[PDB]
Design a binder for these strands. Structure first.
Lengths: 49, 405
DNA sequence: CCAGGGCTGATCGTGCAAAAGTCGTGCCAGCCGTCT
């Protein structure tokens, strides 16, 4: 993970029992941004015709 | 060489499916034992019939118009064309009352549905319907409409010069208007499902471990017919002796059938070794490197006769990493080569293929030129043989194959 | 009682000549590019 400045306080109820409030600086710095990789395969599937 | 042998012979001449057919079919006559729910997943594909039906519901028609339409869409095919006719639907509805324009009215609205131009009337009303669709701000809509209306017969000849003086058009400008018609892309029914399922003919297998591939038959395909040990012992203790004769007969025929079958298997394997011993060249290198083989050469290999092998190799398949091939495919004629040698027809066929594929597409090579080229390489063949090999490979034309340089 | 001869059920051999298909290739007719 990454080291982020944390606090323990309610903020208009945006930090409920199991919710976390994230600032906008985190989005700008591309923090926790991940990259997913997928694959697509195709076969010729030779037939009678 | 009586009846028993007679039947044993027809046993190997046929493919494996009809063999299993007769085997299993005759396995019911005499006691001789052979030996995540319901739906896998289940999915109901839509299709360009159900999709044309979907639209009908949404749209507002009356109770009578609805029937007509149902009937119309039944006539639609995979290609996209109403199959029968206009008046045909009127004659098939059995009611003389309903006018011929009645169907037209409905049919005039069903063909602006999803793919527009569906259910066209004889591969031409399509363009008319497809063209009327997009806006009138297109550059040469007039011209193209006029072309399509009565001047398609002329367009059929792939000729453009005649269209000027016929229908009072400009100088080649129409040509750009003729390209508009080419982009129309007819047959909007064929947006169909490309779900053609996969096919196979697996019979014997060849696999290349440590060089010198070994030939061995399929584990599942081959049928194993055993005898029952249970009913065997039951013959000695039989009472009326009628029973005993019955069981003796069943027993003797079973043994006979068993041996016959095995004989088939053994023969197949033997013939599956000779070829591999002779034609290692082909499995390694390709069709270009096949040696010629005849029935007489295979019979002479291992204590065999021509007649016998002739039957084994009919409708038999072999799977190798090269491909899937019939055994009859390996045998072919030969031609005289340089140095007294013999060259297989398949080598010449592959050579012709690769030579035509690598020739200059601008100006095509004549069969005489190909004959001369082959003679220069050291093959020594006639022009007729080249013509036949070219014609055999779904290539009738030699010089007519000319595209834009 | 044992060995010799006849009876009979058990057991098998995947070859062989004749009629038809195939290609190697020559012969001949139809078609087009070019110079006359």
């Amino acid at each position: 993970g990454q080291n982020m400045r944390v606090a323990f306080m309610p903020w208009n109820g945006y930090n409920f029992e199991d919710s976390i409030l994230v600032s906008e600086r985190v989005v700008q710095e591309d923090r926790f941004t991940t990259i997913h990789i997928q694959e697509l395969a195709c076969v010729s599937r030779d037939t009678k015709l | 060489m009586t009846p028993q042998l007679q039947q044993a012979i027809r046993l190997l001449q046929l493919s494996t499916l009809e063999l299993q057919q007769e085997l299993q079919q005759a396995l019911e006559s005499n006691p001789l034992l052979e030996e995540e729910l319901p739906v896998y997943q289940g999915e109901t594909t839509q299709t360009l019939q159900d999709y044309l039906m979907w639209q009908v519901e949404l749209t507002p028609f009356t109770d009578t118009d609805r029937a007509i339409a149902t009937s119309i869409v039944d006539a639609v095919d995979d290609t996209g064309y109403l199959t029968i006719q206009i008046e045909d639907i009127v004659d098939s509805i059995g009611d003389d009352e309903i006018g011929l324009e009645e169907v037209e009215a409905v049919l005039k609205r069903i063909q602006r549905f999803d793919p527009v131009g569906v259910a066209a009337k004889d591969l031409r009303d399509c363009l008319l319907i497809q063209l009327s669709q997009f806006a009138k701000e297109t550059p040469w809509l007039e011209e193209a409409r006029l072309i399509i209306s009565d001047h398609l017969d002329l367009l059929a000849n792939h000729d453009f010069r005649t269209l000027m003086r016929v229908t009072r058009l400009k100088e080649e400008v129409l040509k750009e208007a003729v390209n508009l018609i080419q982009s129309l892309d007819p047959r909007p029914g064929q947006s169909i499902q490309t779900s053609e399922p996969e096919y196979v003919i697996p019979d014997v297998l060849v696999r290349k471990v440590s060089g010198r591939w070994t030939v061995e038959l399929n584990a599942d395909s081959i049928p194993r017919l055993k005898i029952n040990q249970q009913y065997a012992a039951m013959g000695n203790s039989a009472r009326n002796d009628a029973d005993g004769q019955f069981i003796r007969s069943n027993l003797q025929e079973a043994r006979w059938l068993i041996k016959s079958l095995e004989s088939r298997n053994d023969t197949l394997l033997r013939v599956s070794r000779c070829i591999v011993e002779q034609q290692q060249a082909f499995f390694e290198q390709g069709e270009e490197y096949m040696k010629p083989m005849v029935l007489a050469d295979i019979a002479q290999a291992v204590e065999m006769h021509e007649s016998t092998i002739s039957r084994v190799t009919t409708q038999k398949y072999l799977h190798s990493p090269r491909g899937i091939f019939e055994l009859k495919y390996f045998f072919s004629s030969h031609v005289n080569t340089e140095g007294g040698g013999e060259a297989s027809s398949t080598a010449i066929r592959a050579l012709v293929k690769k030579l035509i594929a690598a020739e200059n597409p601008a100006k095509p090579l004549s069969d005489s030129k190909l004959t001369s080229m082959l003679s220069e390489q050291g093959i020594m063949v006639a022009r007729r043989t080249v013509a036949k090999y070219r014609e055999s490979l779904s290539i009738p034309p030699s010089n007519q194959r000319k595209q834009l340089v």
